[PDB]
Subunit: 251 residues, 4 copies
């Protein structure tokens, strides 16, 4: 309780899974939250499932849409006051090796996972700096920012990009005394309804050769590290990677 008092957060892809759990715990800890998704039909229902309009609202936005980012920040500031916290969580995956990735697939994945995170990070620094907000940008990544997956070529590219791009931003903010931190979060496998719909997926992810714990995580596992990062408790943490992966990358 109260760990995010006064904070105002944007969470992209906040209607499902990890992003929804981050939204839920953010509201529980006192933050006001704007969640997004490319589609409108889930959004209002997702928001209402967490809290009331004074706590959480929905804004339809595709994170690859550069001009839509300014509309999103404006709507959030209108609802809740100046934005303090950005969680760049929206992402997609292509299940292809590098060898088998089409250029269209490459460009589509990079538009969401890389351009979108760049647009959000750039705008968030501009809008959040020098306001005494204790501002925090949390760029969602994954184990795939540290290790390869033969069947996730473009996804690996995007996650490695966000990993090191975030360090650049962290350093510049720290050196300019902007009062903006930038860090990455790296989930391993997490159980969601989407994983549940893929026959065999959780079992494959839970083999000890993949996740040493012998089971995948849950959305709140990623929510709680995000609360820590969004809060002033982490005021000395910037430019770093926070891994919550059941041991996947330790072997």
């Amino acid at each position: 309780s109260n760990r995010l008092d006064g904070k105002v957060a944007i969470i992209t892809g906040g209607t499902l899974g990890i992003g929804l759990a981050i939204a839920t715990k953010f509201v529980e800890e006192g933050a006001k939250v704007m969640i997004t998704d490319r589609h409108s039909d889930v959004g209002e229902k997702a928001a209402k499932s967490v809290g009331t309009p004074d706590q959480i609202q929905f804004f339809q936005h595709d994170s690859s849409d550069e001009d839509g980012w300014t509309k999103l920040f404006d709507a959030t500031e209108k609802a809740f006051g100046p934005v303090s916290t950005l969680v760049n969580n929206a992402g997609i995956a292509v299940n292809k090796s590098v060898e088998e990735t089409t250029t269209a697939e490459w460009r589509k994945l990079l538009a969401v996972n890389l351009d979108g995170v760049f647009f959000g990070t750039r705008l968030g620094i501009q809008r959040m700096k020098n306001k005494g907000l204790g501002a925090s940008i949390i760029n969602m990544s994954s184990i795939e920012g540290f290790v390869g997956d033969p069947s996730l070529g473009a996804y690996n590219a995007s996650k490695g990009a966000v990993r090191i791009m975030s360090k650049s931003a962290a350093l510049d903010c720290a050196l300019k005394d902007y009062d903006v931190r930038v860090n990455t979060v790296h989930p391993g496998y997490i159980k969601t309804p989407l994983v549940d719909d893929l026959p065999g997926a959780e079992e494959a992810m839970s083999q000890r050769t993949k996740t040493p714990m012998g089971h995948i995580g849950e959305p709140n596992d990623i929510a709680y590290i995000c609360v820590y990062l969004a809060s002033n408790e982490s005021k000395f943490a910037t430019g770093s990677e926070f891994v919550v992966d059941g041991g996947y990358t330790a072997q």
Copy 2:
């Protein structure tokens, strides 16, 4: 509040600085705590400064003392019930390059920083496994587990050892379903009375070429990441490194 409900923690070197702040926040969040130090004179006063005997006690112990580790676990279990949480925080430094390290210096530093962490980790796994405690071993490290310092040769050795030793332990616990997680915490520079007593030290640490934030951290910066790691909020985190360094390792 309540984030460590029911937890029972041992924190080595818990009478000063980082270890004292970890103890303080642990008590605030509902944990019972046994702090240690090689010396007795500070201990009881340090404990009483945090809370009452039902919350926190002191046990004199040099972490390099193998047999003393069993006495420490026994005393803690006597006071508070079965131990759930171990923070291996006790450490020393030698200000020497590898080239200029004497063998006595080498052996003394490794006894505390490496052997002591091994003894605590080994015993903690034995005593904490298979009890449904949500057990957590937090091995204190530093930026010096990732990067070299020309003037900290043996210290670097110790911190690199603990970094990877902790991953081994994490994996074995995860694969054996022991209900014990093992992670490392990596502070950058932190202001304490000891740093304050070293003329010029904080200023040197605060140069942008060292810490990009332009200032060093405070003990609570390390306390809060430890609360997260000791809590069930981090039940999917094992075998990982948590860095709180003001950007030091991001450049």
Copy 3:
């Protein structure tokens, strides 16, 4: 001598600096080489400066040009026989923080440094696999694939992308028994005529807080690690990062 006997290499951006030195040492060790650059005026002269047409030729190509990649592989195979070795060396830099990067700058840098490396890697796997060539793809990176630079935001993104994308490709090639390895090379600061034309640049790079050796490297420093990687001497090395940086990333 003879360390690249029978090898046929493409080196993008091979007319200057690092790429020219890689070309030079490749020819010395018995490889046939096709160098590229976006511009034609330097190319033939650069090639003739290294060797004769039976050793080394030039092909004008912008690495961001997807269709031009197939023309490049065809021209090389026409000149020298099947390509065994690809060094993705072409790159550019934008001297901007993330905050100050324009979208046009972002897209231009990613087209060369990321898309271009993807196009070359994808095509090289397709054209080099299953031919008993001892094929090797060497994706040029830099220290900026490991650490941030506040003034190199998009460049950091690109270098982190190539770092982890290359691991994906490595794994898929290894698992499919393609006889193609993929590794990254990470130069620190290297003296070239271009650096020499930037007043103050080498001196700034040579400060001990940047490069511990107190001086920057030379193009042959990167050439020699590339020879090792292109050769069968490194037949068990794949998915790894090879750093030649004067100590920059060790502190």
Copy 4:
């Protein structure tokens, strides 16, 4: 040929496997070599199998023996002139988890794998600095300096220690203009007669979940990266890790 002209190398544990292959290729490239082992019976035969006494000799030495290190450097300088190159290759393994490691096992493994590497590194810096030798210390590590193995607890400790200790030494040498570089080499699984004597071992190591190439390496795979590191070709490489692992750590 000639890549180590004039170099004088000490290779600890140089009578078998990886160390023998390093010795072999070092001699082939023009270096004079002193190999060691704790036992005498294999040594002279191993040396004679590589070359004549003017090329390679044997010195009986347990790398854990501190005073024996000065005798070893003296004998090498007597045979061949001033030592330029040290490969700290001697090591042992204990097949125990952290939990199950006895203190005697811990101390024995650390004496060879950590103390021994410290003694060699410290003495080598002292004896090799400021002589214009192009001096190089190559500290053998393994994949177990990057990732955990649940059954290699003390070994992981030792390998993580050497990894970061070597960076400290690298930095101090670079900052003091000592003309001594320090780097680590990280073999994955390598086929040797010892592995061949362990039923099932190579097959287990060759599973794709362990080594993506689907087979283990050979001693020359580690020899060739050591030649590069010992040579002046790598004069700008210090403080870095060189991984030759068949993809083990890329996933």
